């Protein structure tokens, strides 16, 4: 019983790290296309 409790955690802690991983994965995409918006602005604000 305490095996099968052991089980149901780990199931449910790999559907919790997976669903922040994904969510990590996008953010830092959304993040990367930011900066490049971010620094053809910074360029064009100087010249």
Same mark, same amino acid.
């Given at each position: *019983?305490? /095996?099968?409790? #052991?089980? *149901?955690? +780990?199931?449910? $802690?790999? %559907?919790?790290? %997976? ?7 996008? #953010?830092? /995409?959304? $993040? =990367? *296309?930011? =900066? $490049?918006? +971010?620094?053809?602005? $910074?360029?064009? =604000? !100087? !010249?």
């Amino acid at each position: *019983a305490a /095996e099968n409790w #052991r089980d *149901a955690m +780990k199931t449910e $802690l790999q %559907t919790i790290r %997976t669903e922040i991983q994904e969510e990590t994965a996008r #953010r830092q /995409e959304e $993040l =990367n *296309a930011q =900066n $490049l918006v +971010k620094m053809q602005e $910074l360029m064009s =604000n !100087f !010249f």
